[PDB]
Write a protein that binds this ligand. Structure first.
Ligand SMILES: NS(=O)(=O)c1ccc(CNC(=O)Cc2ccccc2)cc1
Ligand SMILES: [Zn+2]
Length: 257
């Protein structure tokens, strides 16, 4: 099946998922000088105070921290969005080296990792319906650079030992995703897709300008995870990122100048 290796990675995906070469694929390079400031953009509303995390899962491609999305407890609204988008999960993409790992790039610059907080539009009722819609998803993307540690990330890195291999899950309640956000909510936004198969073109991407910093020890712990299942040959979960895709007929908008 698809993955991130030489024989099943991003260059192969189009054979099973032809939309890989579609009109609104993600990630993209954000050319800061060509992004258009849009004063018609409302401020972002991140409402995570009632967030209820449930579980953390190694799915063989990344690890997901899952939330209760059966009511409006943690939602994203405003910005470019119309309506209410419910937080379902967050996950990261990261590199084998500090100089690569993010999916979006900024003036071709790669960050060490990228956080994706995935939300779905409540007017579609469930996540499965949402991904079939052009405005079904809103993913909040946050770059990570290596430097000082991120205290709000530590609880996540300390549980990774318990989900080392594909298919492992562990209880992960009472985690506050507000601890992963930078100070500023200045953002760029563009219409794109899921960055893994099925690569559906259902995402309003909202990528924050300000990266968060994580420590070298923190990202090293990401790199100790496994793509494989228990009892299978060890393949380190690193470089689980999709490179930048053609922008084509899209303008990236900025919330700030
Ligand atoms: N990296 S990203 O933030 O763009 C990203 C990628 C994949 C997904 C998950 N998509 C699927 O698992 C498939 C699926 C389809 C229909 C019902 C359920 C699942 C979420 C977010
Ligand atoms: Zn992602």
């Amino acid at each position: 099946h698809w993955g991130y290796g030489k024989h099943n990675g991003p260059e192969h995906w189009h054979k099973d998922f032809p939309i890989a070469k579609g009109e609104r694929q993600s990630p993209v390079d954000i050319d800061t000088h060509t992004a258009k400031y849009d004063p018609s953009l409302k401020p972002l509303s991140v409402s995570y105070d009632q967030a209820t995390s449930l579980r953390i899962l190694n799915n063989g491609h990344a690890f997901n921290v899952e939330f209760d999305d059966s009511q409006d407890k943690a939602v994203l609204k405003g910005g470019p969005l119309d309506g209410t988008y419910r937080l379902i999960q967050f996950h990261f993409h990261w590199g084998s080296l500090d100089g690569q790992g993010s999916e979006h790039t900024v003036d071709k610059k790669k960050y060490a990792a990228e956080l994706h907080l995935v939300h779905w539009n409540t007017k579609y009722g469930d996540f499965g319906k949402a991904v079939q819609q052009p405005d079904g998803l809103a993913v909040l993307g946050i770059f990570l650079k290596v430097g000082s540690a991120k205290p709000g990330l530590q609880k996540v890195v300390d549980v990774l030992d318990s989900i080392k291999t594909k298919g492992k899950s562990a209880d992960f309640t009472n985690f506050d995703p507000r601890g992963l956000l930078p100070e500023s909510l200045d953002y760029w936004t563009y219409p794109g897709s899921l960055t893994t198969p099925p690569l559906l073109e259902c995402v309003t991407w909202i990528v924050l300008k300000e990266p968060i910093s994580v420590s070298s020890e923190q990202v090293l712990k990401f790199r100790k995870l496994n793509f494989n299942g228990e009892g299978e040959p060890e393949e380190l979960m690193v470089d689980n990122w999709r490179p930048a895709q053609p922008l084509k007929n899209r303008q990236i908008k900025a919330s700030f100048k």
